[PDB]
Write a protein that binds this ligand. Sequence first.
Ligand SMILES: NC(=O)c1ccc[n+]([C@@H]2O[C@H](COP(=O)([O-])OP(=O)(O)OC[C@H]3O[C@@H](n4cnc5c(N)ncnc54)[C@H](OP(=O)(O)O)[C@@H]3O)[C@@H](O)[C@H]2O)c1
Ligand SMILES: NC(=O)c1ccc[n+]([C@@H]2O[C@H](COP(=O)([O-])OP(=O)(O)OC[C@H]3O[C@@H](n4cnc5c(N)ncnc54)[C@H](OP(=O)(O)O)[C@@H]3O)[C@@H](O)[C@H]2O)c1
Lengths: 382, 384
Amino acid sequence: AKILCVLYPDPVNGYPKTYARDEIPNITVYDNGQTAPTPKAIDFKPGELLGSVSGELGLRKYLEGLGHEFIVTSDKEGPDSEFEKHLPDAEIIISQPFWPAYLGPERLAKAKKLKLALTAGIGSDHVDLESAIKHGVTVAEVTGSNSISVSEHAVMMILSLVRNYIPAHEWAEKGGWNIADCVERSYDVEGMHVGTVAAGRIGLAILKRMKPFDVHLHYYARHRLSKEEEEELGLTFHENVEDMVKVCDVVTINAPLHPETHHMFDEAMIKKMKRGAYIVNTARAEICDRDAIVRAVESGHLAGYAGDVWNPQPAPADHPWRTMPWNGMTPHMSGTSLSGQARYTAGTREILECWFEGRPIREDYVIVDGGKLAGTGALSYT
Amino acid sequence: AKILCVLYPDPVNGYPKTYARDEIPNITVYDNGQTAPTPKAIDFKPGELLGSVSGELGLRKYLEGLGHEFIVTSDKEGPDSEFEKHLPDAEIIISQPFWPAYLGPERLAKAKKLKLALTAGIGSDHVDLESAIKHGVTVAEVTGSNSISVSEHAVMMILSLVRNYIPAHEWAEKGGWNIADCVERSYDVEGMHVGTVAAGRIGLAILKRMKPFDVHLHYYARHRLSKEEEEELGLTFHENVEDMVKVCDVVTINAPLHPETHHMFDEAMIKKMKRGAYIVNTARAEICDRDAIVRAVESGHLAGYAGDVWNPQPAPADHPWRTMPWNGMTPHMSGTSLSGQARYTAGTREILECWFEGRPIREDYVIVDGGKLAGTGALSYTVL
Ligand SMILES: NC(=O)c1ccc[n+]([C@@H]2O[C@H](COP(=O)([O-])OP(=O)(O)OC[C@H]3O[C@@H](n4cnc5c(N)ncnc54)[C@H](OP(=O)(O)O)[C@@H]3O)[C@@H](O)[C@H]2O)c1
Ligand SMILES: NC(=O)c1ccc[n+]([C@@H]2O[C@H](COP(=O)([O-])OP(=O)(O)OC[C@H]3O[C@@H](n4cnc5c(N)ncnc54)[C@H](OP(=O)(O)O)[C@@H]3O)[C@@H](O)[C@H]2O)c1
């Protein structure tokens, strides 16, 4: 059928001629024991840029290797768009969260022939998980691929906030020194209290990583961890997120976006956070109330917020977070480092393979199949 | 005795009335057993700006109860310096490496009653230690004080380079998205080889901190860590740094500045390093040929460099490290975060007590005493 794939604009220097490196580490196995994607053939050197229009997830050889139709495009907005154009007769839709072709109920209505909305990466929140059920449609996402990538992003975005990196940097770039104005905001993270919403692949990664920084490790999930996990890391479990946000000076959000978590960090929850506390949100923007976050920083109740997730995506030029005080922001770039691109593209292939050769699709990669939250969907999403 | 303490400009918008936090952790022990400072008292709230002029490290009430004179300036360049002015009769001098009072042989010649050249923080390399040995002077830093501050500042820098943070936070501020532009240089550190040049308090810190990133861990040093530490961290020692930099995707430099480390990283050394390697230097700038860094950087042989330390500090505005491609530089700062100031301005104090009281100064604190390298200094530093 028509496979349709929404990928991001190429670099403004055009698709990369050469890269900064000759290769990247080979990664085969994850922490919880899960294996890295296992496609039979890949048609790209890992470490290459697969996630833009030109990269095309190195898929064009395999898909027009059964002479299927394979369209690629960054144009994805409103009903005149290239995406909206090819949408109705498409059977497999592929997009990445970094550049998400959203699939609400009406965009689901128009897609007459859609059988598999396939998230290249993690978090299928851009997809109306209910509607999907109504139309029998199947939804799968490359679970694990880029969780370690994100974890590195978060930790980094923590130290950048607590130590006030970006600003001090902003000085030295423009000729200055200004030490004194640098370290008025600069605290060690050491012996602070730090809190992960969720302790899934990311939240557990982040914890394992902050532990050697001699901080006191707290966390909310809906089920506890093992004892030997909780002891080896030396955690402090919290039933309420309320509970946790009172004691923690740093909170990392690391939970999926579904209606439980919608606006969890609204002005409501911001109350109980300690003055000068910090939020790293690498999970999904809509877990925070945008206009709440802003104020609590402007107000000064929050020392800082940083994150790579926004809403919508792209976020509008005028999105307050961008310019907001002490923002440690980036575009949505953690899941799609070259290192992680390697894995979610593989998986993207793997998942197409089993679908095209009739064979099954890993439990782990499946969010929705056959009208119910199955596999990862059942444990993580609502 | 006259005391002569050199501090740095207060914030352009005045010494601050309030700070966005109301307390900081209570660090009392260190990861080697060593105790934190043990002063008798303080004249500051742990977590106020102390290394600023107006901070006076909470001393101006101690020294004058004891009835000694206390000078404080951020003017130390030229002959004009208020510093060189009070230098001669200065019985005790204190500076912080962030705004260091450089004590060349000229200055140590023209200092006539100095008995104690004291480093606020760590890093007594703004001082000729030979001049200090001959002039019979005693020298000390606050060993431990801010080792952990730095160890974090590095790691953040490692991640920041390897993932292309600033470039991409630039794109955030300038209302773009341009993902391909962010990630075309962005990598995960997971899997890479990382090496620290020294494996001191700091270098060791970094090793422990980096370990759970599943990187491979290399290090050079003149002596080795123990069998226990080399096991639990999966450390690879090298006997030539040349052999370390060859395999390492990332090098952090955590060595003192002294003759063996001066321009360790020349163009010769830098050459050996992998294509697209990264350096982090949260130690002392002059361990790398400033000029050769920039060559390597521009030529895409080194994918980046990051560090707070420079030479000189403070530094020219057209220092090419400020503008070179893909830098992750801060002004000298890692060690004078507020959390660490509260420790070096307590060591600062504790030692002044051990001088006027006439008790042994803590051997860990001591660089030069008795006309020779001793303490930290005997194990860490060296002289021609
Ligand atoms: N580039 C990026 O920024 C990027 C990349 C990848 C992923 N992400 C986001 O991060 C999310 C986390 O993925 P992951 O790597 O952690 O995989 P995961 O193993 O599926 O983690 C999800 C975790 O969320 C917990 N959870 C679900 N609903 C919750 C709720 N209402 N409150 C608290 N915890 C809840 C689940 O445990 P319980 O069921 O026991 O609560 C589970 O441990 C993804 O879904 C995605 O939205 C962002
Ligand atoms: N703001 C900042 O960025 C900041 C803050 C504080 C300190 N620093 C710098 O970091 C330095 C590290 O000292 P520290 O107090 O962190 O810990 P430390 O224990 O004082 O550091 C000394 C370590 O460096 C090693 N070392 C000494 N000379 C060496 C050489 N020539 N080649 C290789 N290794 C050598 C020593 O081991 P061996 O005996 O085996 O050589 C020892 O492991 C300070 O002296 C200072 O220069 C920077």
